[PDB]
């Protein structure tokens, strides 16, 4: 993948969360997520996909991934998906927007989903 | 997984798209997605996660998945993530909201991401 | 306004909420919103804007509006904005997506904002 | 309004856009918006609402507003709604997420709506 090397490794967001990812030659994203906030402790499994053959016109590299907030420690009955783009270079970034859906009753389903935005960098 | 059997199989959304998914005992989602709309043809790899031990209080089952819109036929330099919940029973549903991010230049990054909502059923 | 007559009046969404709106010749939306759900009772002031000169090519009419969830009965320290389009005809609809932001501390700001989708019709 | 004085005035976002707003004692927002980006030129009318009696616990002030992208110069057949919170103090901010809906045909309605985030400050 063009950005396999660029994407693979450890990222930090503005909240102090840790995203550890391996990008596969085939478009796979695999790794672990550790949230600094919310009903979460330690690492959670993540999986996702990225564009392994992006445009060569200076566009970013589209990608996304999912965490279900269940591990051996806690279950927050929720899942977050991050949708965004990898921008390479000296200050590489992954700029994302995310949706967090909780399991709810039908009565509360209107309030099931949060939306936010996270920016990941290789330092901090 | 409590809804492993309920989630695994073929789903159809309101657009006529086809979502074919296997839920793993461990929270994994693996399969293929075929979009009826947009810059897409044939099947794309998807991966995601679901809550394999949901609440027993009648709440839905949180889940999410990603497609990168690259296959052997086309590359739309984009990725969609669906975030939502599985609601079991006679008329099982997956109710989602999604983010579609395109790879963009810095100049166009403000316009990178669409948001929408898809409802998947086992028929149609 | 091209859809001034079409938009002006009483609308109902899938939750049983009531949206009473007047569209001005100049693009203004003014009225009241009554939510069937959440921390809400009776009517709240709404204001917004619509495209008073839409495309003639069968496209819908872009529009949006805001409710701050404060009235003489309650204050939910939150505001919802609906963004969407009016689609005219026998079964007229306003198809929206919405963002609900709560006032939060800096610590909880990552969880400030819900996202959802409401469809309004002239009946039910 | 508790933050009537804090909110009223000229704001700038990260894109270089200009938001000029008056907050009314009653919860009204009225003003003009000038976008640095997209299919836009000069000022557009905006209207919205804010929580005129926010919590006294250090929480921000919920607010939202709408622009329909029609003025005497251009019509982009679209509307943006910003939903967010005002955070007072030495470096006052309005932290928003936004939905931009275009008028579309029914065929293209799945792609009608962009989502993004803007942060407004009193300088730059």
This entry's atomic model was obtained through X-ray
Check if B114 contacts C (Cβ < 8 Å). no
Strand partners, B33: B19, B44
Please report all neighbours of D, defined by 3+ CB atom pairs within 8 A: A, B, C
* CATH node for B3-121: 2.40.128.30
Annotated binding-site members of D: 33, 44, 82, 98, 110
Residue B60 contacts residue A104 (beta carbons within 8 Å): yes
Check if D74 contacts A (Cβ < 8 Å). no
Check if D116 contacts A (Cβ < 8 Å). yes
* Resolution, angstroms, 1 dp: 1.8
* Separation of alpha carbons C54 and D75, rounded Å: 8
Residues of chain D with Cβ-Cβ distance to C112 below 8 Å are 60, 84-85, 95
Q: How close are the terminal C-alpha atoms of chain B, in Å?
A: 26
* D106 burial type by CB count under 10 A (0-12 exposed, 13-18 middle, 19+ buried): exposed
- Which chain D residue has the Cα nearest residue A83? D115
Residues of chain C with Cβ-Cβ distance to A110 below 8 Å are 15, 37-38, 116
| Residues in A 86-105 with any Cβ partner in D closer than 8 A | 97
Check if D117 contacts A (Cβ < 8 Å). yes
CA distance D120 to chain B (A): 15
Return the closest-CA partner of residue D84 out of A124, B18, A108, A116.
A116
* Separation of alpha carbons B49 and A115, rounded Å: 18
Does the annotation list B44 as a binding residue?
yes
- Which chain C residue has the Cα nearest residue D28? C47
Check if A106 contacts C (Cβ < 8 Å). no
* D76 burial type by CB count under 10 A (0-12 exposed, 13-18 middle, 19+ buried): buried
Annotated binding-site members of A for biotin: 33, 44, 82, 98, 110
**Do the chains contact at D115 and B111, CB–CB below 8 Å?**
no
Buried b (16+ CB within 10 A) or exposed e, A71-95: beeebbbbbbbbbbbbbbeeebbbb
**Do the chains contact at A111 and C114, CB–CB below 8 Å?**
yes
**Do the chains contact at B115 and C115, CB–CB below 8 Å?**
yes
Strand partners, B112: none
CA distance A111 to chain C (A): 7
Q: How many CB pairs under 8 A join C and D?
A: 206
Residue A83 structure tokens: 């949708």
Strands A93-102 and C93-102: unpaired
A109 Cβ contact list (under 8 Å, min separation 6): B60, B85, B95
Residue D50 contacts residue D62 (beta carbons within 8 Å): yes
* Separation of alpha carbons C47 and D22, rounded Å: 14
Q: Where are the beta strands (DSSP E) in chain D?
A: 9-12, 18-23, 28-34, 44-50, 61-70, 75-87, 93-102, 113-121
């Amino acid at each position: 993948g063009r950005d396999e090397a660029g994407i693979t490794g450890t990222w930090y967001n503005q909240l102090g969360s840790t995203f550890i990812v391996t990008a596969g030659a085939d478009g796979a994203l695999t790794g672990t997520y550790e949230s600094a906030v919310g009903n979460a402790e330690s690492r959670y499994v993540l999986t996702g996909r990225y564009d392994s053959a992006p445009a060569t016109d200076g566009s970013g590299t589209a990608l996304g991934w999912t965490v279900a907030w269940k591990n051996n420690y806690r279950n927050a009955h929720s899942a977050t998906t991050w949708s965004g783009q990898y921008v390479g270079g000296a200050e590489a970034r992954i700029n994302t927007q995310w949706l967090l859906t909780s399991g709810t009753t039908e009565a509360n389903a209107w309030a099931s989903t949060y939306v936010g935005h996270d920016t990941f960098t290789k330092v901090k």
